[PDB]
C-alpha cells in the first residue's frame, strides 16, 4: 500500500472533521461525491453547473450541501469548499472496473486528474477513495473494532503459548539440555505472533483515533518480543551472528519467508533435511539473552563475555574473579552476571 | 385588497419561473422560506449563517437549494439568489397569528422589514406570502379552476334567465305594456349576475396564465350586460337620468346595495312600499336602449331624440321627416331609427 495513498487515507480517518461529515452522510443515507483539488480554475473543464461557494470548510456545511444532487469540490487540505451541486464529467473512455454511475465517475476522474475523489453510495455504508490508479475502501468503525478485537484475542492465545514455550526453554537452557527443536519451536511461535501484528496493522491505521486502545493493547502484548527473538537467534545460530544480521532474520520470517521448522533451522545455519532430525541436534546458548535482559549487560560488552567463555554454561560456572578478566566487566557487572545467573538456576531448576 | 399587495402576488402567480419552482417544491414536500430583498447588506442583522451565492436565479437552482434547511434570499426582481441555507432572525417579540416556526418567522420578518417573505410548509400544499402586515394565501391551480368552473356554470344559468327576462321585456316594451315589476325583475337578475363576476374576479387573478380561458368565458358571457343595464336605467327611471348617473346606479347595486325589488324601484325614483305594488305601476321606455343598441345612434344624439319625443312609443310613431327635425339626425339616422323599430315590431310582436 503506497505511502502517498496512506496519507490520503488519513484525510478520512476516524477523528477528522471530514470523516465526521462522511459518517453523518452515510447515516442519513444521502450519497456523496467529493473532488479534492488545490486550484479550482484548472478543472473548469471537468466541472459543470453547480454553485461557486469558495467558503471555509466545516463538517456541518459539507453535510448540508450533500443534501443536494451532484458533487462537492473541496481544497486538498480540506480547508475550503469551492463548489457544491456540480456535475463531474471526466472522459467516458477511461477504463473503469466500477458499476455505479458515481463510482465510475469517481474512478475515471481520479485517473484522469491524479486527484482524490471520494464516493459514498446511498445504499451501502463504505467510503470508497480513489486516487490516481488506486482505490481504497474505508470500513465503518464497528466493523474494524470487531476484526481488531478478534485479532487481539487471537494474539493473547499465541502469546500465552509463546510464554509457555519460553519458560520451558529457560529450564532447558539453564540445564544445558537444549535441542534444535526446542529453539525452532520457540522461534516459530514468536514469528507467527509478530505476523499477526503485521496483518492487523492496516485495520489499526484505518481506525484512526478510534484505535488508541487497540494500539496500547498490541504494545503491551508484544513489547519485548522482537528483541527476545533476535537474542535467541544470536544465541543459537550455528555460527556467530551480529545483532543487525539477526534483526534481519527476524524481519525475513515476519514477512517474506514462511516460518517452517526446517526452514528456520536452515536459516540458522543447520544443514537439516527432516523435521524429525531436530530433536537429535544439541545446542548451547551463547549467553546473550541472559546477559542483556537479565544481567543488563550491553551487547557490546556481551560479545566480550561470550568471546571468552563461549557459552552460558561456562559463564554460569565462572567466578567474579574470572568474569572480571573480561574487558568491560568491573566488580559491578561481574557481580550482576554471576548473581543473576545463580539466582535463576536456584529458582527455575 | 391593496394594489400594493397585488403587485407582489404577481411574483408567485402561475406562469412565473418562481411559481414553477414553488410548485416543484410543494410536490417534493421539501420546505421553503424565501426572503426578497433589494440590498442584502442592510439586512445582515436578520440574516445568519448560510452560504453567500450571489448567482443568477433559475427555478432549478431554487428547487435544489431548497433541499437544505433554513432560508433562501433572493433579489426583489427575482433575478438573483444571494443566500441559501441561512437562519432568518426577526425580533421574536413581534406579534404573530401564525403557528409553527416557519410561518411565525416569515410574518415577523415581513412586518419588521416591510419586505416580502414567502413560506411553504411540508404538511400542506399552499403558498403563504407575507408583505408588511399583510398575508396572502396562494391556492393551487386545481382548486382555483374547480371554483371558477362552478362560478362559470352558475353564471350561464343566470345569463340564461336574464336573456329570458330581457326577451319578454322586449315584447312588452314594443307593445308599450311594461310595468315596474318587469323592469326591476330584469335589473335584479342583471345586477346579481355581475355581482358573481366581481366575486370570482380575485380567483381569476390568482390563476395567472392558467386563467386565460376563464377570462375569455367571463367576457363572452357578460359582454354587453353592463351597457344594457345602464340603458335600462336611463329608460325606466322615474325621471330623466344621465348615463353617468345610470352607471353609478349600476356600480352601487353591484357592490354596495342589495338588489332587492323594492330597493331597485326606490333608487329608480319610484316611491313604493310592498313588492305587490310593482305589478300596478305602468312605465314607458324613453328609447335609449333601442336607439343606441339597435338604431346605432350615439347616446349624445339620442339625448336629443328623447328630449323631443320623450318615449319609445312616440319615436315609433314618428316619420322619417319628423325625426330629422332632431339635431344630429340625418336621413340615414332617421331611416335607421324608423326601419329598425318597425322591423322589430313586425317580428317580435
UniProtKB/Swiss-Prot annotation, chains A, B:
<dbReference type="GO" id="GO:0106408">
    <property type="term" value="F:diadenylate cyclase activity"/>
</dbReference>
<dbReference type="InterPro" id="IPR010994">
    <property type="entry name" value="RuvA_2-like"/>
</dbReference>
<keyword id="KW-0460">Magnesium</keyword>
<dbReference type="Pfam" id="PF10635">
    <property type="entry name" value="DisA-linker"/>
</dbReference>
<protein>
    <recommendedName>
        <fullName>DNA integrity scanning protein DisA</fullName>
        <ecNumber>2.7.7.85</ecNumber>
    </recommendedName>
</protein>
<feature type="binding site">
    <location>
        <position position="101"/>
    </location>
    <ligand>
        <name>3',3'-c-di-AMP</name>
    </ligand>
</feature>
<comment type="subunit">
    <text>Homooctamer.</text>
</comment>
<feature type="binding site">
    <location>
        <position position="88"/>
    </location>
    <ligand>
        <name>3',3'-c-di-AMP</name>
    </ligand>
</feature>
<keyword id="KW-0808">Transferase</keyword>
<dbReference type="GO" id="GO:0003677">
    <property type="term" value="F:DNA binding"/>
</dbReference>
<dbReference type="GO" id="GO:0004016">
    <property type="term" value="F:adenylate cyclase activity"/>
</dbReference>
<comment type="similarity">
    <text>Belongs to the DisA family.</text>
</comment>
<dbReference type="GO" id="GO:0006281">
    <property type="term" value="P:DNA repair"/>
</dbReference>
<comment type="function">
    <text>Has diadenylate cyclase activity, catalyzing the condensation of 2 ATP molecules into cyclic di-AMP (c-di-AMP). c-di-AMP likely acts as a signaling molecule that may couple DNA integrity with a cellular process. This rate-limiting step is the accessibility of the active site; mutating the possible exit tunnel (residues 128-130) increases product 2-fold despite Arg-124 being important for ATP-binding. Does not convert GTP to c-di-GMP.</text>
</comment>
<dbReference type="Pfam" id="PF00633">
    <property type="entry name" value="HHH"/>
</dbReference>
<dbReference type="InterPro" id="IPR018906">
    <property type="entry name" value="DNA_integrity_scan_DisA_link"/>
</dbReference>
<dbReference type="InterPro" id="IPR023763">
    <property type="entry name" value="DNA_integrity_scanning_protein"/>
</dbReference>
<feature type="binding site">
    <location>
        <position position="105"/>
    </location>
    <ligand>
        <name>3',3'-c-di-AMP</name>
    </ligand>
</feature>
<feature type="domain" description="DAC">
    <location>
        <begin position="2"/>
        <end position="142"/>
    </location>
</feature>
<dbReference type="InterPro" id="IPR050338">
    <property type="entry name" value="DisA"/>
</dbReference>
<dbReference type="Pfam" id="PF02457">
    <property type="entry name" value="DAC"/>
</dbReference>
<keyword id="KW-0547">Nucleotide-binding</keyword>
<dbReference type="GO" id="GO:0140097">
    <property type="term" value="F:catalytic activity, acting on DNA"/>
</dbReference>
<feature type="binding site">
    <location>
        <position position="122"/>
    </location>
    <ligand>
        <name>3',3'-c-di-AMP</name>
    </ligand>
</feature>
<keyword id="KW-0227">DNA damage</keyword>
<dbReference type="InterPro" id="IPR038331">
    <property type="entry name" value="DisA_sf"/>
</dbReference>
<keyword id="KW-0238">DNA-binding</keyword>
<dbReference type="InterPro" id="IPR000445">
    <property type="entry name" value="HhH_motif"/>
</dbReference>
<dbReference type="InterPro" id="IPR036888">
    <property type="entry name" value="DNA_integrity_DisA_N_sf"/>
</dbReference>
<dbReference type="GO" id="GO:0005524">
    <property type="term" value="F:ATP binding"/>
</dbReference>
<dbReference type="InterPro" id="IPR003390">
    <property type="entry name" value="DNA_integrity_scan_DisA_N"/>
</dbReference>
<keyword id="KW-0067">ATP-binding</keyword>
<comment type="function">
    <text>Participates in a DNA-damage check-point. DisA forms globular foci that rapidly scan along the chromosomes searching for lesions.</text>
</comment>
<feature type="binding site">
    <location>
        <position position="70"/>
    </location>
    <ligand>
        <name>3',3'-c-di-AMP</name>
    </ligand>
</feature>
<keyword id="KW-0234">DNA repair</keyword>
<keyword id="KW-0548">Nucleotidyltransferase</keyword>
<dbReference type="GO" id="GO:0016787">
    <property type="term" value="F:hydrolase activity"/>
</dbReference>
